[PDB]
Amino acid sequence: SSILEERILGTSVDLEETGRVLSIGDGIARVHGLRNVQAEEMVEFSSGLKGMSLNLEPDNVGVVVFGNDKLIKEGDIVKRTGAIVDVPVGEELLGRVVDALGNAIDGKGPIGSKTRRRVGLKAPGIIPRISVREPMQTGIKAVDSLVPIGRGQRELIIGDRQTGKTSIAIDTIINQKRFNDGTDEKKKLYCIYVAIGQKRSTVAQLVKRLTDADAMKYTIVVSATASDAAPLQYLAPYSGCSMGEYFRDNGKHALIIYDDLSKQAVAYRQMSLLLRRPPGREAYPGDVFYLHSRLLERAAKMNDAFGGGSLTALPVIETQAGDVSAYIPTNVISITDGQIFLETELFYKGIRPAINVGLSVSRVGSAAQTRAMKQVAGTMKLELAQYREVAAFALDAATQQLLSRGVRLTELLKQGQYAPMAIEEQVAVIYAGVRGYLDKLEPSKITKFENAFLSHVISQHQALLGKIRADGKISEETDAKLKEIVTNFLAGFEA
Amino acid sequence: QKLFVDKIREYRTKRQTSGGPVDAGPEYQQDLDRELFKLKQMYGKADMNTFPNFTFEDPKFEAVEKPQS
Amino acid sequence: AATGRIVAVIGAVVDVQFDEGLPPILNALEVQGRETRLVLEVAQHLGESTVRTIAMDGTEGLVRGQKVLDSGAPIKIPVGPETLGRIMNVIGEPIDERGPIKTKQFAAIHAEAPEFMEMSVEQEILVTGIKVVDLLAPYAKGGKIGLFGGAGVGKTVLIMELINNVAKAHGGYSVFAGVGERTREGNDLYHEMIESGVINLKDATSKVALVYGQMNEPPGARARVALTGLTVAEYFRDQEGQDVLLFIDNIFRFTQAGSEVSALLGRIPSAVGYQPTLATDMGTMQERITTTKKGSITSVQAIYVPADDLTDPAPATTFAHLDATTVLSRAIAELGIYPAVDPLDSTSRIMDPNIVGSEHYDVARGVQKILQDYKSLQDIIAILGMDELSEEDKLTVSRARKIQRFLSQPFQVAEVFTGHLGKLVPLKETIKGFQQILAGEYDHLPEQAFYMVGPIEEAVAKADKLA
Amino acid sequence: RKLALKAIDWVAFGEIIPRNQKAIANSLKSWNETLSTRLAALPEKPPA
Amino acid sequence: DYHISVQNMMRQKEQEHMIRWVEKHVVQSISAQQEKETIAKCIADLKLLAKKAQAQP
Amino acid sequence: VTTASPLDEATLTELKTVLKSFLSKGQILKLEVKVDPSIMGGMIVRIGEKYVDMSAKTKIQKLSRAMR
């Protein structure tokens, strides 16, 4: 009872500058009035809505609304706040779900923040940067061994609909728990997820999936669903990048994900056409390239004079009927540092996740990769490269052995869902395959062997894994041990 | 200030009630009962302090009992 | 409340000028001096005390200077438990010649979507008795379902089969909304629902309500019927605790009708002639058909693809609002396989081992892999011929061709013009029948014995007769 | 609870008299592996 | 867990209804005569407030 | 100047006296007296592009307690 009395217990009025509305329709308002108004400045309406001014013309100002427009009507009053649009920032936002402007929608309560930051800022130049040198681990076997990713990089995920793009990011987010539940702060990573254009129930299921694995304690979710106004979907990614930049400048590392960048361009096209600007190709605005180029340039690796922080990005794109030579995808292909391709034909042939290893690339050259993994992955590259060039015809000395090894190697890369692996276990499981210990078993039974052998190795040989983790490389004694373990378990495992 | 003090006075008037809202509401009790029933159905039926304790035997006991043993 | 004057009439767009008391957006207005009621809806505020509206009926006979009166609220329709067994229209007037509808309360068409904290995340399965759907892309309870297909491929036969199989045994209510379709089909549906017993004319035991606006109406009406159905669907979910089934026929006409007025409103067309606001106004309508912490709604929608094109902007933005997809193909229908469901292009959200079980999932993945492999040999067979293949390829070709036949099925609603008898298969029999074919136990039977039958036992008997 | 089991060599275990006992050993492999997996899955100490 | 959840739900419902009652009775209590007398007091107060604001060029 | 009820002419000339004080450098102010009873009570003043709102709009402020 007294709580509400104290809430109402805690009123000043002052002059303000004002314009009057001339017209209103379809979310665009024409305002007569305001004289000393800056470009890209936030204004406020009578009822409580908010807007931003983009067109400054001799006789009127064009204002876009951040919400519904059924309450604005001709003759109303508009005031100017005096500040360019900005969002709250800090580390009190961890574990919360907020909208595009930093308002809680999860029902917990107000957010106690002390800092604000603009959404449109410039990327770091040439001096404050340094090379990329540290690894970013995901838990996917086919990614950590053939398409490695460093800290400070940009990587593209591109494919058709219903191929598996979201689950890669969901698995990547979960894997980071084993580092955040530790001691040293030089190997922790924070995560940010941004949803653009999706429906609410999918986001609810995603949040429930995250909270049952104890991962919400270090994640931030920013959502602008399909029922929101176009300006909010247009503004959402920058509002999340500005939240990510806070960690980068204080010696910490962070990760950000933009889901369906293709759905921001449609909102930009809708917003621009209603402002009476001429169209272009497919009625897109004339500068859709500059919309993403200034966004994907803000991820960088800072040197020691500025702290040593970093920020990583993973955009997502969708293509129509597997057409990679369209308008929008070609723009974003030429900006990033690499891409991962997903296909339906591989999806229906039992290859899940459906990664096309013949086209996926990573322009880092394995500069940031553990020493142990290189020894067993550099040799798997050659095996698969030589397998692909022969084993597709729609002798025994060379050909039969080649595809006998290749069919075994393909089966090793398949993996389940919501279960990433540590690095050393992947090293062991690949070490078993590459050396030829499994060239006798029928390929149909490889997965059961993988599962049983992993469980046995985890339980009975916990001391061996620590050696590989601590040393970072294999040794003669370790190599001696592994052969005996593998041969004995293979002999005993025949069921 | 004037509106604030008026609302404070009315909040104190609300506090003057012996118990419950001034307007009990013909449907407030019905809505509360419906919500409680939905919560009970979703969470399952539970008694005040019932603590059952029943222990089963060993399931699928595997032995060496065989003709060749 | 206030009076205006008509200033311009062009097609289905009318402009009014108010001396005082400018009405707000989305209010309804009434025209004075007509035999039949005519209602207008406010859309824009132009300036100089003028508004631009959209009509809900024909606009022939209007003269500049005529009087228009204000109402003060959006369109309101009668809603309640007495709409069961009746037929309404866009603005809630009875068209079944049985008198007025006496309900206690009314409701407005336009509202807002449920918030984020009211969502439910439970998932179950729904059994339909059709082999392809249950085996490959099963449905769910309280989810959204869409049926894609061209013209003449069979969407409405499937909708009527689903009605016949599911609606009758349901314990809750049902709502059918028809947008932009044939009138004679509505008459047929009304008469057969009278005959079955769902609609009762002498008591209060009906369990369906009907709302219609067909393809003989001006575009203003066809852009607003689906919300009229949505309102009566939502009343049974919120005020009462009930499970509701909602059937919508050709929701594509909701989008097409909106682009016939975009040009008259003074906008720049975006792409293939569509209006710039195509995704936002679809998202506004779709987000209201959901399941909350007060009830459940199950949706079945039929969608149309122009000129057999799946990349058209209209059907390409509906994929993101569904939980299960069923795509129909003309090429399959040419070969005589009914229903013509494409097995390599249909998905569902609950196809995972931890919901449907391991065995079902393994069988589905095996049949999909076998189907995919046979598609990659078409170029060689089409030119060089069957003789160039090895033995294993011939075996895979024979097994895939046998599997394709067994996916067809006879429907009960098609018995009149096909000379067959309807069938209904349980789930276990389908799983076991596909396991047996995958295991090769029936390699000694002709491929023509697996055509238009139910359970697997009927294949051996038809093969035995066809010796 | 705490366990005290004896390590075995399955290579020599297969050498013991297998006549008319192959099925028993095949079942024993499954039981011995699966029970160990289940035991390792859950902590021996009582929950919190 | 069950009992705690039920009690919390009851608390939330009561808070919401009390807020609604207070606001509605504020609107109801405000009467035309109250408005006249309060508007006279406000004429004095707001004239002084305008003097205060105008004192700051 | 906008008000819910018609203010007295003596209060009107007092208001003119203080409004000229705000006007400072300029000419004779043009006063439009408007009586809108929609507001519960208060006073709304516009002077060029300046704008001060002192009316029953504070109910929204008191309603915001429910949010926080």
Ligand SMILES: Nc1ncnc2c1ncn2[C@@H]1O[C@H](COP(=O)(O)OP(=O)(O)OP(=O)(O)O)[C@@H](O)[C@H]1O
């Ligand atoms: N490794 C995997 N094993 C099994 N199923 C998988 C795997 N990866 C993805 N799937 C399944 O693939 C389907 C599609 O996955 P996902 O939701 O990631 O697709 P998407 O590319 O995001 O699609 P959309 O365009 O609809 O958003 C889901 O049913 C998911 O369970």
Ligand SMILES: Nc1ncnc2c1ncn2[C@@H]1O[C@H](COP(=O)(O)OP(=O)(O)O)[C@@H](O)[C@H]1O
């Ligand atoms: N299951 C079926 N069995 C036999 N014929 C069918 C079946 N489904 C569709 N057809 C054919 O399609 C025609 C009806 O098409 P229709 O369902 O009206 O297509 P749409 O739903 O696209 O309008 C019928 O004349 C019939 O010949």
Ligand SMILES: [Mg+2]
């Ligand atoms: Mg996705």
Ligand SMILES: [Mg+2]
């Ligand atoms: Mg049809």
